Design an enzyme around this catalytic site. Structure first.
Site, PDB file in Angstrom:
ATOM      1  N   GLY B  37       0.803  -1.231   0.000  1.00 31.39           N
ATOM      2  CA  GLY B  37       0.000   0.000   0.000  1.00 31.39           C
ATOM      3  C   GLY B  37       0.831   1.274   0.000  1.00 31.39           C
ATOM      4  O   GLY B  37       1.959   1.284  -0.529  1.00 31.39           O
ATOM      5  N   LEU B 186       6.874  18.867   5.190  1.00 32.47           N
ATOM      6  CA  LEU B 186       8.179  19.177   5.827  1.00 32.47           C
ATOM      7  C   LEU B 186       9.258  18.167   5.473  1.00 32.47           C
ATOM      8  O   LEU B 186      10.436  18.532   5.229  1.00 32.47           O
ATOM      9  CB  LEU B 186       8.030  19.290   7.335  1.00 32.47           C
ATOM     10  CG  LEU B 186       7.072  20.379   7.837  1.00 32.47           C
ATOM     11  CD1 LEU B 186       7.000  20.243   9.334  1.00 32.47           C
ATOM     12  CD2 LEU B 186       7.352  21.852   7.481  1.00 32.47           C
ATOM     13  N   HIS B 445      25.618   5.788  30.447  1.00 32.21           N
ATOM     14  CA  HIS B 445      26.336   7.032  30.226  1.00 32.21           C
ATOM     15  C   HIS B 445      27.520   6.721  29.339  1.00 32.21           C
ATOM     16  O   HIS B 445      28.245   5.781  29.597  1.00 32.21           O
ATOM     17  CB  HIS B 445      26.833   7.609  31.531  1.00 32.21           C
ATOM     18  CG  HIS B 445      27.671   8.859  31.347  1.00 32.21           C
ATOM     19  ND1 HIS B 445      27.118  10.051  30.987  1.00 32.21           N
ATOM     20  CD2 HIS B 445      29.079   9.046  31.381  1.00 32.21           C
ATOM     21  CE1 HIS B 445      28.105  10.975  30.842  1.00 32.21           C
ATOM     22  NE2 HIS B 445      29.312  10.357  31.103  1.00 32.21           N
TER      23      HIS B 445
HETATM   24  C1  LIG Z   1       5.069  10.548   1.559  1.00 32.27           C
HETATM   25  C2  LIG Z   1       4.417   9.781   2.720  1.00 32.27           C
HETATM   26  C3  LIG Z   1       5.201   9.479   3.844  1.00 32.27           C
HETATM   27  C4  LIG Z   1       4.649   8.784   4.917  1.00 32.27           C
HETATM   28  N1  LIG Z   1       5.405   8.506   5.972  1.00 32.27           N
HETATM   29  C5  LIG Z   1       4.925   7.837   7.062  1.00 32.27           C
HETATM   30  C6  LIG Z   1       5.815   7.498   8.216  1.00 32.27           C
HETATM   31  O1  LIG Z   1       7.011   7.861   8.196  1.00 32.27           O
HETATM   32  N2  LIG Z   1       5.280   6.817   9.244  1.00 32.27           N
HETATM   33  C7  LIG Z   1       3.944   6.461   9.285  1.00 32.27           C
HETATM   34  O2  LIG Z   1       3.499   5.851  10.262  1.00 32.27           O
HETATM   35  N3  LIG Z   1       3.074   6.668   8.290  1.00 32.27           N
HETATM   36  C8  LIG Z   1       3.512   7.373   7.165  1.00 32.27           C
HETATM   37  N4  LIG Z   1       2.686   7.684   6.060  1.00 32.27           N
HETATM   38  C9  LIG Z   1       1.263   7.277   6.069  1.00 32.27           C
HETATM   39  C10 LIG Z   1       1.157   5.785   5.875  1.00 32.27           C
HETATM   40  O3  LIG Z   1       1.672   5.537   4.556  1.00 32.27           O
HETATM   41  C11 LIG Z   1      -0.307   5.382   6.000  1.00 32.27           C
HETATM   42  O4  LIG Z   1      -0.805   5.795   7.294  1.00 32.27           O
HETATM   43  C12 LIG Z   1      -0.349   3.872   5.844  1.00 32.27           C
HETATM   44  O5  LIG Z   1       0.256   3.497   4.570  1.00 32.27           O
HETATM   45  C13 LIG Z   1      -1.753   3.278   6.006  1.00 32.27           C
HETATM   46  O6  LIG Z   1      -1.833   1.823   5.857  1.00 32.27           O
HETATM   47  P1  LIG Z   1      -3.363   1.276   5.555  1.00 32.27           P
HETATM   48  O7  LIG Z   1      -4.034  -0.092   6.059  1.00 32.27           O
HETATM   49  O8  LIG Z   1      -4.187   2.334   6.347  1.00 32.27           O
HETATM   50  O9  LIG Z   1      -3.568   1.752   4.008  1.00 32.27           O
HETATM   51  P2  LIG Z   1      -2.592   1.936   2.688  1.00 32.27           P
HETATM   52  O10 LIG Z   1      -1.083   1.889   2.985  1.00 32.27           O
HETATM   53  O11 LIG Z   1      -3.000   3.225   1.906  1.00 32.27           O
HETATM   54  O12 LIG Z   1      -2.980   0.549   1.899  1.00 32.27           O
HETATM   55  C14 LIG Z   1      -4.279   0.349   1.279  1.00 32.27           C
HETATM   56  C15 LIG Z   1      -4.350  -0.383  -0.085  1.00 32.27           C
HETATM   57  O13 LIG Z   1      -5.697  -0.571  -0.607  1.00 32.27           O
HETATM   58  C16 LIG Z   1      -5.662  -0.454  -2.043  1.00 32.27           C
HETATM   59  N5  LIG Z   1      -7.083  -0.309  -2.504  1.00 32.27           N
HETATM   60  C17 LIG Z   1      -7.866   0.787  -2.364  1.00 32.27           C
HETATM   61  N6  LIG Z   1      -9.127   0.541  -2.832  1.00 32.27           N
HETATM   62  C18 LIG Z   1      -9.191  -0.737  -3.274  1.00 32.27           C
HETATM   63  C19 LIG Z   1     -10.234  -1.609  -3.884  1.00 32.27           C
HETATM   64  N7  LIG Z   1     -11.490  -1.105  -4.084  1.00 32.27           N
HETATM   65  N8  LIG Z   1      -9.882  -2.885  -4.226  1.00 32.27           N
HETATM   66  C20 LIG Z   1      -8.648  -3.377  -3.996  1.00 32.27           C
HETATM   67  N9  LIG Z   1      -7.650  -2.621  -3.432  1.00 32.27           N
HETATM   68  C21 LIG Z   1      -7.839  -1.310  -3.055  1.00 32.27           C
HETATM   69  C22 LIG Z   1      -4.636   0.642  -2.329  1.00 32.27           C
HETATM   70  O14 LIG Z   1      -4.086   0.534  -3.654  1.00 32.27           O
HETATM   71  C23 LIG Z   1      -3.610   0.381  -1.197  1.00 32.27           C
HETATM   72  O15 LIG Z   1      -2.563  -0.512  -1.571  1.00 32.27           O
HETATM   73  C24 LIG Z   1       3.209   8.353   4.919  1.00 32.27           C
HETATM   74  C25 LIG Z   1       2.391   8.648   3.804  1.00 32.27           C
HETATM   75  C26 LIG Z   1       2.970   9.338   2.702  1.00 32.27           C
HETATM   76  C27 LIG Z   1       2.081   9.672   1.508  1.00 32.27           C
HETATM   77  C1  LIG Z   2      38.991   4.665  27.889  1.00 32.87           C
HETATM   78  C2  LIG Z   2      37.858   4.507  28.899  1.00 32.87           C
HETATM   79  C3  LIG Z   2      36.571   4.537  28.385  1.00 32.87           C
HETATM   80  C4  LIG Z   2      35.466   4.360  29.210  1.00 32.87           C
HETATM   81  N1  LIG Z   2      34.244   4.352  28.666  1.00 32.87           N
HETATM   82  C5  LIG Z   2      33.147   4.215  29.486  1.00 32.87           C
HETATM   83  C6  LIG Z   2      31.802   4.269  28.918  1.00 32.87           C
HETATM   84  O1  LIG Z   2      31.748   4.440  27.642  1.00 32.87           O
HETATM   85  N2  LIG Z   2      30.756   4.136  29.808  1.00 32.87           N
HETATM   86  C7  LIG Z   2      30.906   3.897  31.176  1.00 32.87           C
HETATM   87  O2  LIG Z   2      29.948   3.781  31.937  1.00 32.87           O
HETATM   88  N3  LIG Z   2      32.088   3.824  31.804  1.00 32.87           N
HETATM   89  C8  LIG Z   2      33.228   4.014  30.986  1.00 32.87           C
HETATM   90  N4  LIG Z   2      34.519   4.003  31.508  1.00 32.87           N
HETATM   91  C9  LIG Z   2      34.645   3.780  32.979  1.00 32.87           C
HETATM   92  C10 LIG Z   2      34.357   5.128  33.655  1.00 32.87           C
HETATM   93  O3  LIG Z   2      35.413   6.078  33.384  1.00 32.87           O
HETATM   94  C11 LIG Z   2      34.219   4.832  35.143  1.00 32.87           C
HETATM   95  O4  LIG Z   2      33.249   3.779  35.308  1.00 32.87           O
HETATM   96  C12 LIG Z   2      33.765   6.077  35.853  1.00 32.87           C
HETATM   97  O5  LIG Z   2      34.617   7.211  35.509  1.00 32.87           O
HETATM   98  C13 LIG Z   2      33.821   5.789  37.356  1.00 32.87           C
HETATM   99  O6  LIG Z   2      33.397   6.967  38.113  1.00 32.87           O
HETATM  100  P1  LIG Z   2      33.950   7.110  39.646  1.00 32.87           P
HETATM  101  O7  LIG Z   2      33.357   8.431  40.204  1.00 32.87           O
HETATM  102  O8  LIG Z   2      33.756   5.625  40.156  1.00 32.87           O
HETATM  103  O9  LIG Z   2      35.597   7.289  39.635  1.00 32.87           O
HETATM  104  P2  LIG Z   2      36.634   8.084  38.655  1.00 32.87           P
HETATM  105  O10 LIG Z   2      35.836   8.686  37.467  1.00 32.87           O
HETATM  106  O11 LIG Z   2      37.911   7.223  38.320  1.00 32.87           O
HETATM  107  O12 LIG Z   2      37.062   9.407  39.520  1.00 32.87           O
HETATM  108  C14 LIG Z   2      37.142   9.670  40.911  1.00 32.87           C
HETATM  109  C15 LIG Z   2      38.255  10.733  41.114  1.00 32.87           C
HETATM  110  O13 LIG Z   2      39.055  10.511  42.279  1.00 32.87           O
HETATM  111  C16 LIG Z   2      40.308  11.181  42.135  1.00 32.87           C
HETATM  112  N5  LIG Z   2      41.092  10.820  43.337  1.00 32.87           N
HETATM  113  C17 LIG Z   2      41.616   9.592  43.622  1.00 32.87           C
HETATM  114  N6  LIG Z   2      42.194   9.566  44.867  1.00 32.87           N
HETATM  115  C18 LIG Z   2      41.998  10.805  45.411  1.00 32.87           C
HETATM  116  C19 LIG Z   2      42.336  11.439  46.702  1.00 32.87           C
HETATM  117  N7  LIG Z   2      43.008  10.680  47.601  1.00 32.87           N
HETATM  118  N8  LIG Z   2      42.014  12.757  46.913  1.00 32.87           N
HETATM  119  C20 LIG Z   2      41.329  13.447  45.968  1.00 32.87           C
HETATM  120  N9  LIG Z   2      40.961  12.937  44.746  1.00 32.87           N
HETATM  121  C21 LIG Z   2      41.260  11.623  44.414  1.00 32.87           C
HETATM  122  C22 LIG Z   2      40.694  10.733  40.751  1.00 32.87           C
HETATM  123  O14 LIG Z   2      41.614  11.765  40.383  1.00 32.87           O
HETATM  124  C23 LIG Z   2      39.328  10.849  40.014  1.00 32.87           C
HETATM  125  O15 LIG Z   2      39.117  12.166  39.426  1.00 32.87           O
HETATM  126  C24 LIG Z   2      35.649   4.172  30.690  1.00 32.87           C
HETATM  127  C25 LIG Z   2      36.971   4.164  31.246  1.00 32.87           C
HETATM  128  C26 LIG Z   2      38.074   4.332  30.386  1.00 32.87           C
HETATM  129  C27 LIG Z   2      39.469   4.289  30.951  1.00 32.87           C
END
Ligand SMILES: Cc1cc2nc3c(=O)[nH]c(=O)nc-3n(C[C@H](O)[C@H](O)[C@H](O)COP(=O)(O)OP(=O)(O)OC[C@H]3O[C@@H](n4cnc5c(N)ncnc54)[C@H](O)[C@@H]3O)c2cc1C
Ligand SMILES: Cc1cc2nc3c(=O)[nH]c(=O)nc-3n(C[C@H](O)[C@H](O)[C@H](O)COP(=O)(O)OP(=O)(O)OC[C@H]3O[C@@H](n4cnc5c(N)ncnc54)[C@H](O)[C@@H]3O)c2cc1C
Lengths: 461, 465
Positions: B37, B186, B445
């Site tokens: 559709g 849009l 985080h």
């Molecule tokens: C440009 C565009 C972007 C969109 N983007 C989104 C989006 O991002 N997210 C979103 O949720 N919705 C979006 N929509 C809307 C979405 O497409 C509709 O809400 C959805 O397709 C509805 O599904 P349906 O069951 O309601 O009908 P439809 O998808 O319209 O399907 C109904 C079908 O019945 C057929 N038909 C009609 N009459 C008869 C008949 N008498 N005998 C046999 N077959 C028949 C038609 O040819 C059609 O295939 C968009 C619509 C457009 C135009």
């Molecule tokens: C490369 C890398 C990537 C990571 N990526 C992620 C991620 O993507 N997601 C995630 O959840 N975790 C990640 N981690 C782990 C994350 O950094 C730690 O889980 C988090 O920072 C722990 O927080 P914290 O407060 O336990 O201690 P910390 O952040 O180690 O800091 C506590 C502070 O205590 C200070 N300190 C120590 N002793 C003393 C003292 N005696 N007096 C005063 N100050 C002191 C240190 O200087 C430090 O600033 C990553 C770690 C590394 C190394």
């Protein structure tokens, strides 16, 4: 003060803000010349900025022509890329600073030490000390880089580097060895592999990633291998040393066998991080550590000493920034007299490779190990309309649900925007939702999130 | 047959598959040479393919240098971009035809007509009539492009175009005027603007987008305006005609008086779509239509004729594909004797502009009109770490919650990945959750989704960041 936090990483800085909002007068004691700790300064934030820019570099080379967008071979301006990384760090560091000023939190530069009797000493680099006093102390000192067990390794941060040196290399290395196939190794090794380094990952375990779900990790390994990263798994590193202009890494099969030496210009050591306790005077204060060097705590975050609490990477549980922040909020609430809770069963984890990996709840290995009977539903992004329009069809969503009750027990996503989409599964699990409940929730079409609904329906039917 | 579906749009096709999976013997009657559709052939799918491609084109020109990636001046290959659109359409359409084979659903090409008393006639291109019988008939005929309130306009699909022509222009026009500031206007306007057209949106309301939350729609207008799109709002169009080789649109202020003419190489008419019931024979069957041309139905999707049902764009409620699919499943479940249910309070809506816009639940204007006291929490992407890392800092999340119970009543996101992140708010609302529930859920985080958590915390108390 009402509360002194020692460290300003995610756990401590969030603890300080929450406590300030609950009406406490707060001080935060930090060594570092900036707030934000590991995550904002040398961790999550800088590595995410490089991951993003290197991913856009890769996409410019490989992902535009099929869209009708024709560009000449992309060229890298590494210094410009590093300036993006720096500007992102500075935004984040300044944002903490602004929040401490908004919330009237007093910052103290220097090394803090827990004295015991509601006292904390601060010593700044200039040498002078001050004793602060507070009814409550939160230890939030975070973690440090680890080395290689049994191997001596000299970090110089240009050739043998930790994640700190690897975020700031002066040039794309011709070749890089990553010791450790955990999150940090794979993320940094993808960064440099994208920018033109030949990257090999050498890992002790037979699989990459920790106890992440095995299937997802194996699929990630397969994809990263297609991206040109070489893996040496089940490999015991016995040496990693500067050699001439580069470095030499020696390893042998973990189960025994002949050794191999690999040459590379840079070696990143990214083995598991360790709690950072040195300098806090904990032995003298009577704050007990467990056998892995973590501050031992009860369920209210209290250490062996009254009025002293600990959170984040320095205590047990996943070493993740958001885990540490959730603990910071709980302890602040606890100290203010509300019970604080962290739901340890619903903490998402994300790996920012491409494809991105995200998980929440149990893995298949944990359910099998627990003897839990479960159902699996999986739906691939190749069958999703939005993934197809965006040419981002790698990976899948998997939902695990209890056999008897259909309760979702875990969800795991590999693919574009995984770390965003996992949250609808985190929210579902907070409500004890079933796979049916998730699969019946209306999802907009066309979105990649429809694969989470479809996976859930597959688990239920 | 147990079931004859008339139309293979998302409602009718999903209805057919669910029905088959529930054990029924299903026929689908469709006039077009392909399934899926409006959404899959001329709707959501092709639109999203051009939107992604044309956004990558804009990012290649403008979004790479700041990250250290040097690509000189990118070139548009319109032919290859259109080839991606058509490839995406083909996989989706071929997918529907695979699922019909796998579920043993029979397809009939032709015009379906509701005869009543268990029967549907199918007339093919040749003029031959076959009469199918079934215990249940589902009308899933979808919608059609609407015109301009009281102005005649002759669609030619190269100069005066609907969305169908706008998806397939043979070259980038220098200028395009889009009549209707809704989702479709849009989106298509954005596609061509990125590819180098000068675009102007002319709209009857004083606001773009419905219907949608006013602040969000206002923010989107502002951003699109910075991107070089002109808006003439509060504008009544009185003419839209070829002045070969281009076209001319005349309008006057709905409220004021003085008229303006505007010329452009192409004019897109994108006013509200309308239900399509042509060819069904409803008056003769006794199936009652409302004033808006929609099939009247009860709580089980049943029309005024027993055994005749209707779903999708032909009946009340938002004209969205996933809404039609939800109705398609519900009615297949009802016809099988089960409890089919659609939660009209939780149907997310997405606008695939950049920034992307997504909403679920009530808008502030709805709450105000209903007299409900509510709280607002808002958190901007300028304060989110992941958004900063990705240079995608525009927009915000806004959560609306009941003043007394903190129950989340609506959520609205403008920014990158908004149509994905809206789903954790949809899940929360499905369970009847509060903003505190959402704000205390652990979010990874750094992710942009942390802005949802912080917006929820600000609704409940205060945000942390
Ligand atoms: C440009 C565009 C972007 C969109 N983007 C989104 C989006 O991002 N997210 C979103 O949720 N919705 C979006 N929509 C809307 C979405 O497409 C509709 O809400 C959805 O397709 C509805 O599904 P349906 O069951 O309601 O009908 P439809 O998808 O319209 O399907 C109904 C079908 O019945 C057929 N038909 C009609 N009459 C008869 C008949 N008498 N005998 C046999 N077959 C028949 C038609 O040819 C059609 O295939 C968009 C619509 C457009 C135009
Ligand atoms: C490369 C890398 C990537 C990571 N990526 C992620 C991620 O993507 N997601 C995630 O959840 N975790 C990640 N981690 C782990 C994350 O950094 C730690 O889980 C988090 O920072 C722990 O927080 P914290 O407060 O336990 O201690 P910390 O952040 O180690 O800091 C506590 C502070 O205590 C200070 N300190 C120590 N002793 C003393 C003292 N005696 N007096 C005063 N100050 C002191 C240190 O200087 C430090 O600033 C990553 C770690 C590394 C190394």
């Amino acid at each position: 003060y009402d509360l002194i936090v020692i460290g300003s990483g995610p756990g401590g800085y969030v603890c300080a803000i929450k406590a300030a909002q609950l009406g406490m007068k707060v001080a935060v004691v930090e060594k570092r010349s900036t707030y934000g700790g590991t995550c904002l300064n040398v961790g999550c934030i800088p590595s995410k900025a490089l991951l993003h820019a290197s991913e856009m570099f890769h996409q410019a080379q490989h992902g535009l022509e099929a869209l009708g967008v024709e560009v000449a071979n992309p060229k890298l301006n590494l210094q410009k890329m590093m300036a993006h990384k720096d500007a992102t760090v500075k935004s984040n560091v300044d944002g903490v600073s602004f929040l401490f000023k908004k919330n009237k939190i007093d910052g103290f530069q220097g090394t803090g030490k827990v004295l015991g009797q509601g006292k904390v000493s601060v010593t700044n680099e200039k040498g002078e000390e001050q004793v602060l006093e507070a009814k409550n102390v939160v230890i939030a000192t975070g973690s440090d880089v680890a080395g290689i067990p049994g191997v001596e390794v000299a970090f110089d941060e240009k050739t043998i580097v930790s994640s700190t040196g690897a975020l700031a290399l002066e040039k794309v290395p011709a070749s890089m060895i990553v010791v450790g196939g955990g999150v940090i190794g794979l993320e940094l090794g993808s960064v440099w592999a994208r920018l033109g380094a030949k990257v090999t990952v050498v890992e002790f375990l037979d699989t990459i990633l920790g106890g992440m779900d095995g299937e997802v990790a194996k699929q990630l390994q397969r994809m990263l291998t297609k991206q040109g990263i070489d893996f040496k798994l089940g490999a015991k590193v016995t040496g990693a040393v500067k050699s001439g202009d580069g470095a030499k890494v020696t390893f042998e099969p973990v189960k025994g066998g002949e050794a191999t030496t690999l040459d590379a210009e840079v070696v990143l050591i990214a083995t598991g991080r360790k709690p950072s306790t040195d300098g806090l005077g904990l032995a003298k204060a009577g704050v007990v550590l467990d056998s892995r060097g973590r501050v031992e705590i009860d369920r209210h975050f209290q250490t062996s000493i009254a009025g002293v609490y600990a959170i984040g990477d320095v205590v047990r549980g996943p070493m993740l920034a958001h885990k540490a922040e959730d603990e910071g909020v709980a302890v602040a609430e606890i100290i203010a007299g509300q019970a604080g809770h962290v739901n340890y069963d619903v903490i998402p984890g994300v790996v920012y490779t491409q494809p991105e990996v995200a998980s929440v709840g149990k893995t298949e290995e944990e359910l099998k190990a627990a003897g839990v009977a479960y159902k699996i539903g999986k739906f691939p992004f190749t069958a999703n309309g939005r993934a197809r329009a965006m040419l981002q069809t790698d990976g899948f969503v998997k939902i695990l649900a209890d056999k008897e009750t259909d309760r979702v027990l875990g969800g795991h996503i590999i693919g574009f925007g995984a770390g965003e989409m996992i949250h609808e599964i985190a929210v579902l699990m907070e409500f004890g939702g079933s796979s049916e409940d998730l699969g019946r929730t209306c999802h907009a079409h066309p979105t990649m999130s429809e694969a989470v609904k479809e996976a859930a329906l597959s688990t239920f039917f």
